[PDB]
Protein backbone atom coordinates (compact mmCIF):
# COMPACT_ATOMS: atom_id res chain seq x y z
CA UNK A 1 0.00 0.00 0.00
CA UNK A 2 1.04 3.66 0.39
CA UNK A 3 0.45 4.15 4.12
CA UNK A 4 0.27 2.07 7.28
CA UNK A 5 -3.40 3.06 7.36
CA UNK A 6 -4.05 1.16 4.11
CA UNK A 7 -1.83 -1.77 5.13
CA UNK A 8 -3.83 -2.16 8.36
CA UNK A 9 -7.09 -1.35 6.56
CA UNK A 10 -6.48 -4.14 4.04
CA UNK A 11 -5.73 -6.61 6.85
CA UNK A 12 -8.94 -5.71 8.63
CA UNK A 13 -6.97 -4.56 11.65
CA UNK A 14 -6.51 -1.34 13.61
CA UNK A 15 -3.29 0.57 13.73
CA UNK A 16 -3.55 3.43 16.18
CA UNK A 17 -1.57 6.15 17.92
CA UNK A 18 -1.63 8.12 21.15
CA UNK A 19 -2.85 11.61 20.42
CA UNK A 20 -1.78 14.77 22.16
CA UNK A 21 -4.38 17.33 20.89
CA UNK A 22 -1.99 20.25 21.40
CA UNK A 23 0.20 18.82 18.63
CA UNK A 24 -2.41 18.97 15.87
CA UNK A 25 -1.21 22.53 15.28
CA UNK A 26 2.22 21.32 14.16
CA UNK A 27 1.59 20.67 10.48
CA UNK A 28 3.95 17.74 10.08
CA UNK A 29 2.41 15.89 13.04
CA UNK A 30 -1.14 16.33 11.75
CA UNK A 31 -0.17 15.27 8.24
CA UNK A 32 1.14 11.96 9.58
CA UNK A 33 -1.64 11.61 12.14
CA UNK A 34 -4.18 12.10 9.34
CA UNK A 35 -2.74 9.65 6.80
CA UNK A 36 -0.96 6.78 8.59
CA UNK A 37 -3.52 5.62 11.16
CA UNK A 38 -7.09 4.36 11.45
CA UNK A 39 -7.52 4.51 15.22
CA UNK A 40 -6.70 7.02 17.93
CA UNK A 41 -6.52 7.05 21.71
CA UNK A 42 -5.98 10.01 23.98
CA UNK A 43 -2.43 9.90 25.39
CA UNK A 44 -3.43 11.80 28.58
CA UNK A 45 -6.79 13.52 27.93
CA UNK A 46 -9.13 10.83 29.22
CA UNK A 47 -7.36 9.74 32.43
CA UNK A 48 -8.89 10.37 35.87
CA UNK A 49 -6.70 13.38 36.77
CA UNK A 50 -7.40 15.05 33.43
CA UNK A 51 -11.14 14.33 33.61
CA UNK A 52 -11.99 14.80 37.31
CA UNK A 53 -9.53 17.27 38.96
CA UNK A 54 -11.82 18.02 41.91
CA UNK A 55 -14.56 15.65 43.06
CA UNK A 56 -17.63 15.77 40.77
CA UNK A 57 -16.14 18.66 38.80
CA UNK A 58 -15.55 17.10 35.39
CA UNK A 59 -13.41 18.57 32.61
CA UNK A 60 -14.03 17.02 29.21
CA UNK A 61 -12.27 19.74 27.18
CA UNK A 62 -9.20 17.79 26.04
CA UNK A 63 -11.18 14.59 25.92
CA UNK A 64 -13.72 16.06 23.50
CA UNK A 65 -10.98 17.49 21.29
CA UNK A 66 -9.54 14.00 20.76
CA UNK A 67 -13.01 12.56 20.22
CA UNK A 68 -13.83 15.29 17.71
CA UNK A 69 -10.57 14.61 15.88
CA UNK A 70 -11.51 10.94 15.55
CA UNK A 71 -15.02 11.59 14.20
CA UNK A 72 -13.79 14.31 11.82
CA UNK A 73 -11.16 12.11 10.23
CA UNK A 74 -13.05 8.83 10.35
CA UNK A 75 -10.86 6.97 12.84
CA UNK A 76 -11.93 4.57 15.55
CA UNK A 77 -11.83 5.95 19.11
CA UNK A 78 -10.21 3.99 21.92
CA UNK A 79 -10.82 5.07 25.50
CA UNK A 80 -8.01 5.10 28.07
CA UNK A 81 -8.56 4.83 30.97
CA UNK A 82 -11.24 4.71 33.63
CA UNK A 83 -9.57 3.02 36.60
CA UNK A 84 -5.80 3.17 37.10
CA UNK A 85 -3.92 3.53 40.38
CA UNK A 86 -1.31 5.89 38.94
CA UNK A 87 -2.15 9.57 38.47
CA UNK A 88 -5.20 9.30 40.73
CA UNK A 89 -6.04 12.85 41.88
CA UNK A 90 -5.15 13.54 45.50
CA UNK A 91 -8.78 13.99 46.56
CA UNK A 92 -9.60 10.41 45.58
CA UNK A 93 -6.62 8.93 47.36
CA UNK A 94 -7.74 10.58 50.63
CA UNK A 95 -11.16 8.91 50.43
CA UNK A 96 -11.99 5.53 52.01
CA UNK A 97 -14.56 2.79 52.36
CA UNK A 98 -17.91 3.47 50.74
CA UNK A 99 -17.04 7.08 49.96
CA UNK A 100 -14.11 5.93 47.84
CA UNK A 101 -16.18 3.24 46.16
CA UNK A 102 -18.87 5.86 45.41
CA UNK A 103 -16.31 8.13 43.76
CA UNK A 104 -15.00 5.30 41.61
CA UNK A 105 -18.48 4.31 40.46
CA UNK A 106 -19.39 7.94 39.81
CA UNK A 107 -16.20 8.57 37.87
CA UNK A 108 -16.80 5.49 35.74
CA UNK A 109 -20.45 6.29 35.13
CA UNK A 110 -19.97 9.92 34.23
CA UNK A 111 -16.91 9.51 31.99
CA UNK A 112 -18.36 6.55 30.10
CA UNK A 113 -21.73 8.30 29.78
CA UNK A 114 -20.13 11.43 28.29
CA UNK A 115 -18.34 9.50 25.56
CA UNK A 116 -21.10 6.94 24.94
CA UNK A 117 -21.48 6.29 21.26
CA UNK A 118 -18.08 7.81 20.50
CA UNK A 119 -15.64 5.52 22.31
CA UNK A 120 -15.71 2.05 20.76
CA UNK A 121 -13.71 0.28 23.49
CA UNK A 122 -12.62 1.33 26.92
CA UNK A 123 -9.66 0.38 29.03
CA UNK A 124 -11.79 -0.02 32.14
CA UNK A 125 -9.10 -1.25 34.53
CA UNK A 126 -5.39 -0.77 33.90
CA UNK A 127 -2.44 -2.40 35.74
CA UNK A 128 -4.35 -4.31 38.41
CA UNK A 129 -1.79 -7.10 38.73
CA UNK A 130 1.60 -7.17 40.38
CA UNK A 131 4.77 -8.12 38.58
CA UNK A 132 5.35 -11.52 40.05
CA UNK A 133 1.71 -12.54 40.18
CA UNK A 134 -1.14 -11.68 42.47
CA UNK A 135 -2.82 -8.30 42.89
CA UNK A 136 -0.98 -5.01 42.81
CA UNK A 137 -0.10 -4.01 46.36
CA UNK A 138 0.42 -0.28 45.77
CA UNK A 139 -2.94 0.45 44.16
CA UNK A 140 -5.28 2.69 46.17
CA UNK A 141 -8.10 0.73 44.60
CA UNK A 142 -6.72 -2.59 45.82
CA UNK A 143 -5.90 -1.31 49.32
CA UNK A 144 -9.18 0.41 49.92
CA UNK A 145 -11.63 -1.87 48.14
CA UNK A 146 -10.20 -5.37 48.00
CA UNK A 147 -10.34 -7.88 45.14
CA UNK A 148 -13.80 -6.95 43.96
CA UNK A 149 -13.12 -3.44 42.73
CA UNK A 150 -12.43 -4.76 39.22
CA UNK A 151 -15.79 -6.48 38.80
CA UNK A 152 -17.54 -3.41 40.20
CA UNK A 153 -15.91 -1.12 37.66
CA UNK A 154 -16.78 -3.37 34.75
CA UNK A 155 -20.38 -3.64 35.83
CA UNK A 156 -20.66 0.12 36.19
CA UNK A 157 -19.04 0.76 32.80
CA UNK A 158 -21.46 -1.61 31.09
CA UNK A 159 -24.35 0.06 32.91
CA UNK A 160 -23.34 3.49 31.64
CA UNK A 161 -22.50 2.39 28.09
CA UNK A 162 -24.27 -0.78 26.82
CA UNK A 163 -22.26 -1.20 23.60
CA UNK A 164 -18.65 -0.19 24.16
CA UNK A 165 -16.19 -3.10 24.46
CA UNK A 166 -14.82 -3.29 27.99
CA UNK A 167 -11.14 -4.20 28.23
CA UNK A 168 -8.77 -5.07 31.07
CA UNK A 169 -5.25 -3.73 30.29
CA UNK A 170 -1.79 -4.55 31.66
CA UNK A 171 1.94 -4.49 30.97
CA UNK A 172 4.59 -7.24 31.19
CA UNK A 173 1.94 -9.79 30.28
CA UNK A 174 3.16 -10.30 26.70
CA UNK A 175 4.52 -13.72 27.46
CA UNK A 176 3.51 -16.61 29.68
CA UNK A 177 4.63 -15.74 33.17
CA UNK A 178 3.22 -15.27 36.68
CA UNK A 179 1.53 -11.95 35.95
CA UNK A 180 -0.17 -13.03 32.72
CA UNK A 181 -1.14 -16.29 34.36
CA UNK A 182 -2.97 -14.30 37.05
CA UNK A 183 -4.65 -12.07 34.44
CA UNK A 184 -5.67 -15.17 32.53
CA UNK A 185 -7.37 -16.53 35.65
CA UNK A 186 -9.32 -13.31 36.18
CA UNK A 187 -10.48 -13.32 32.53
CA UNK A 188 -11.54 -17.00 32.71
CA UNK A 189 -13.47 -16.35 35.92
CA UNK A 190 -15.19 -13.25 34.56
CA UNK A 191 -16.40 -15.01 31.41
CA UNK A 192 -17.55 -17.99 33.52
CA UNK A 193 -19.50 -15.76 35.90
CA UNK A 194 -20.85 -13.52 33.15
CA UNK A 195 -18.95 -10.44 34.31
CA UNK A 196 -18.90 -7.98 31.35
CA UNK A 197 -15.42 -8.09 29.80
CA UNK A 198 -14.89 -8.15 26.07
CA UNK A 199 -11.21 -7.71 25.56
CA UNK A 200 -7.72 -7.94 26.98
CA UNK A 201 -5.20 -5.26 26.16
CA UNK A 202 -1.44 -5.79 26.18
CA UNK A 203 0.62 -2.63 26.77
CA UNK A 204 4.03 -3.61 25.36
CA UNK A 205 6.49 -0.93 26.47
CA UNK A 206 9.36 -3.18 25.34
CA UNK A 207 13.14 -2.79 25.09
CA UNK A 208 14.95 -3.42 21.84
CA UNK A 209 15.70 -7.14 21.51
CA UNK A 210 13.74 -8.31 24.57
CA UNK A 211 10.56 -9.30 22.73
CA UNK A 212 9.10 -12.48 24.30
CA UNK A 213 9.26 -15.31 21.82
CA UNK A 214 5.94 -16.63 23.03
CA UNK A 215 3.84 -13.50 22.39
CA UNK A 216 1.58 -15.30 19.90
CA UNK A 217 0.96 -18.37 22.04
CA UNK A 218 0.03 -16.08 24.87
CA UNK A 219 -2.23 -13.89 22.75
CA UNK A 220 -3.86 -17.02 21.44
CA UNK A 221 -4.65 -18.56 24.82
CA UNK A 222 -6.57 -15.42 25.83
CA UNK A 223 -8.46 -15.41 22.56
CA UNK A 224 -9.64 -18.93 23.35
CA UNK A 225 -11.23 -17.57 26.55
CA UNK A 226 -13.84 -15.86 24.40
CA UNK A 227 -12.44 -12.32 24.33
CA UNK A 228 -10.72 -10.08 21.80
CA UNK A 229 -7.05 -9.18 22.29
CA UNK A 230 -5.11 -6.08 21.37
CA UNK A 231 -1.77 -4.41 21.81
CA UNK A 232 -2.70 -1.10 23.41
CA UNK A 233 0.59 0.77 23.85
CA UNK A 234 3.59 -0.24 21.74
CA UNK A 235 7.11 1.18 21.64
CA UNK A 236 10.57 -0.36 21.58
CA UNK A 237 13.00 1.82 23.46
CA UNK A 238 16.77 1.71 23.10
CA UNK A 239 19.72 3.38 24.69
CA UNK A 240 20.52 6.55 22.80
CA UNK A 241 22.07 7.58 20.52
CA UNK A 242 20.99 5.06 18.00
CA UNK A 243 22.89 3.59 15.07
CA UNK A 244 22.07 1.46 11.98
CA UNK A 245 22.16 -1.68 14.12
CA UNK A 246 19.81 -0.68 16.93
CA UNK A 247 17.27 0.59 14.42
CA UNK A 248 17.62 -2.55 12.34
CA UNK A 249 16.85 -4.70 15.39
CA UNK A 250 13.98 -2.49 16.53
CA UNK A 251 12.67 -2.82 13.02
CA UNK A 252 12.72 -6.56 13.46
CA UNK A 253 11.07 -6.20 16.84
CA UNK A 254 8.14 -4.18 15.52
CA UNK A 255 7.63 -6.82 12.89
CA UNK A 256 7.52 -9.61 15.45
CA UNK A 257 4.91 -7.88 17.56
CA UNK A 258 2.73 -6.92 14.63
CA UNK A 259 3.23 -10.40 13.22
CA UNK A 260 2.02 -12.09 16.43
CA UNK A 261 -1.18 -10.05 16.27
CA UNK A 262 -1.77 -11.09 12.63
CA UNK A 263 -1.57 -14.82 13.53
CA UNK A 264 -4.28 -14.58 16.21
CA UNK A 265 -7.58 -14.06 14.36
CA UNK A 266 -9.05 -12.18 17.32
CA UNK A 267 -6.25 -9.63 17.64
CA UNK A 268 -8.05 -6.37 16.74
CA UNK A 269 -4.93 -4.32 16.07
CA UNK A 270 -1.79 -2.55 17.20
CA UNK A 271 -1.58 0.95 18.77
CA UNK A 272 1.82 2.77 18.88
CA UNK A 273 2.33 5.18 21.76
CA UNK A 274 3.03 8.35 19.81
CA UNK A 275 4.10 9.46 16.35
CA UNK A 276 7.61 10.84 16.67
CA UNK A 277 10.49 10.20 19.10
CA UNK A 278 10.45 14.00 19.46
CA UNK A 279 7.46 13.80 21.82
CA UNK A 280 8.07 10.35 23.40
CA UNK A 281 7.45 9.79 27.06
CA UNK A 282 10.59 7.67 27.31
CA UNK A 283 13.43 10.21 27.91
CA UNK A 284 11.50 11.59 30.89
CA UNK A 285 11.14 8.34 32.86
CA UNK A 286 14.03 6.37 31.39
CA UNK A 287 16.95 8.86 31.27
CA UNK A 288 19.47 7.77 28.67
CA UNK A 289 16.92 5.72 26.64
CA UNK A 290 14.55 6.68 23.82
CA UNK A 291 14.12 6.46 20.03
CA UNK A 292 11.16 4.15 20.67
CA UNK A 293 8.77 5.25 17.92
CA UNK A 294 8.39 4.77 14.17
CA UNK A 295 9.29 8.36 13.28
CA UNK A 296 12.39 10.16 14.48
CA UNK A 297 12.57 13.72 15.83
CA UNK A 298 12.70 15.07 12.25
CA UNK A 299 9.64 13.10 11.04
CA UNK A 300 11.75 10.72 9.02
CA UNK A 301 10.52 7.19 8.50
CA UNK A 302 12.81 4.98 10.60
CA UNK A 303 13.37 1.35 9.43
CA UNK A 304 10.51 0.14 11.64
CA UNK A 305 8.00 1.74 9.27
CA UNK A 306 8.80 -0.60 6.43
CA UNK A 307 8.73 -3.44 8.96
CA UNK A 308 5.23 -2.68 10.24
CA UNK A 309 3.95 -2.36 6.66
CA UNK A 310 5.38 -5.79 5.84
CA UNK A 311 4.01 -7.25 9.03
CA UNK A 312 0.49 -6.19 7.99
C1 LIG B 1 1.82 3.22 29.34
O1 LIG B 1 2.93 3.96 29.85
C2 LIG B 1 2.92 5.29 29.28
C3 LIG B 1 4.24 5.97 29.66
O2 LIG B 1 4.72 5.52 30.92
C4 LIG B 1 1.66 6.05 29.76
O3 LIG B 1 1.58 7.32 29.11
C5 LIG B 1 2.17 8.39 29.82
O4 LIG B 1 1.55 8.60 31.07
C6 LIG B 1 2.28 9.52 31.88
C7 LIG B 1 1.56 9.58 33.23
O5 LIG B 1 0.14 9.48 33.08
C8 LIG B 1 2.41 10.89 31.16
O6 LIG B 1 3.40 11.67 31.84
C9 LIG B 1 2.83 10.77 29.68
O7 LIG B 1 2.57 12.00 29.01
C10 LIG B 1 2.09 9.64 28.98
O8 LIG B 1 2.67 9.39 27.72
C11 LIG B 1 0.39 5.26 29.44
O9 LIG B 1 -0.73 5.88 30.06
C12 LIG B 1 0.54 3.84 29.98
O10 LIG B 1 -0.66 3.11 29.78
Curated annotation (Swiss-Prot):
GH10 domain sequence ranges: 1-311
Enzyme category, top tier: hydrolase
Catalytic reactions of this protein: Hydrolysis of (1->4)-beta-D-glucosidic linkages in cellulose and cellotetraose, releasing cellobiose from the non-reducing ends of the chains; Endohydrolysis of (1->4)-beta-D-xylosidic linkages in xylans
Record-annotated disulphide pairs: 167-199, 261-267
Positions of the catalytic residues: 127, 233
GO MF term list: cellulose 1,4-beta-cellobiosidase activity; endo-1,4-beta-xylanase activity; polysaccharide binding
Alphabetical keyword list: Carbohydrate metabolism, Cellulose degradation, Disulfide bond, Glycosidase, Hydrolase, Multifunctional enzyme, Polysaccharide degradation, Repeat, Signal, Xylan degradation
E.C. code: 3.2.1.91, 3.2.1.8
GO biological process, one term: xylan catabolic process
UniProt miscellaneous comment: The linker region (also termed 'hinge') may be a potential site for proteolysis.
Described function: Hydrolyzes both cellulose and xylan. Also has weak endoglucanase activity.
Family: Belongs to the glycosyl hydrolase 10 (cellulase F) family.
Name of the protein this chain belongs to: Exoglucanase/xylanase
Organism phylogeny: Bacteria, Bacillati, Actinomycetota, Actinomycetes, Micrococcales
Residues of the full protein shown: 42 to 353 of 484
Amino acid sequence: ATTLKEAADGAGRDFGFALDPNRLSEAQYKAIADSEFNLVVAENAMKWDATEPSQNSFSFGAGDRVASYAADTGKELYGHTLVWHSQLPDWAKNLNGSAFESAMVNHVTKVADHFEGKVASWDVVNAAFADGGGRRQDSAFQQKLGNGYIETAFRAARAADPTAKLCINDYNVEGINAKSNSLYDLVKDFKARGVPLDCVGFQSNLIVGQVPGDFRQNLQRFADLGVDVRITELDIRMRTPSDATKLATQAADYKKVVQACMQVTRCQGVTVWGITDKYSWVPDVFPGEGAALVWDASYAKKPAYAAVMEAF
